[PDB]
Amino acid sequence: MQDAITSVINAADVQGKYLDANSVEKLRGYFQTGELRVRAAATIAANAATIIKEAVAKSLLYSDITRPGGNMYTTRRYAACIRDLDYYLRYATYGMLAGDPSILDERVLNGLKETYNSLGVPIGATIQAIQAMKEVTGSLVGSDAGKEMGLYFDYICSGLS
Amino acid sequence: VTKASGGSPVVKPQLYKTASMLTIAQAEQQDRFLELGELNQLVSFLNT
């Protein structure tokens, strides 16, 4: 659980040296985007339910995982999805603010693909839901902010694959 | 048939206590060294 400042301090500390010009050079780069990330995390908090409603209706709403036999049939199983998609849109918001994807594999990625295989959850439909959820997130926060929030979505999709 | 498995670690069930034994275990259970009483406790049994 490290942000961009924590990761910069760790690497500069792990060699026992002070924060030289290169370490502060990245820190200044993070502070420049500090204004963009909060507004990105602002609108995502507002439209959390709307984004997840848009992703599932755009990716896996009417596919036969939704029908009987599919992986999402029963109401408990459907309700687990939007609960499950809420974490991906939420933890991706944390990575967008912290500027470092360490929180994702610390709290989301580890034991995740090994868990879906246990339950039999289709990893293929899961990533496309996150990809569609990444597509709507670029709608709200804009282009570059979508590039930032989108940079952690595919990090989840990559490791979850 | 059972389609999963938690593993079977080597477990030795208890059988009895001994005077040499349990107060080596009591001071162990608190995560502290042997104290003078329970360690003088270990002594005078081996003098028997």
Binding site: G111, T115, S118, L119 | T2, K3, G6, G7, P9, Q14
Partner: protein
């Protein structure tokens, strides 16, 4: 609260291995969930490995 070990209580056959794993100092490093996968593979078929 104490740890309800093997020689404390009538144990159950279903989480025999896992509970003996959990009552060890090695417990906080199985970062992968040991029990939610084990209780779910009891119902599903054999996995690919």
């Amino acid at each position: 609260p104490y740890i309800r070990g093997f020689g404390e209580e009538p144990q159950e056959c279903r989480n025999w291995g896992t509970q003996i794993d959990l009552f060890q100092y090695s417990a906080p490093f199985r970062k992968v969930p040991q029990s939610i996968t084990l209780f779910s593979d009891y119902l599903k078929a054999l996995p690919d490995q």
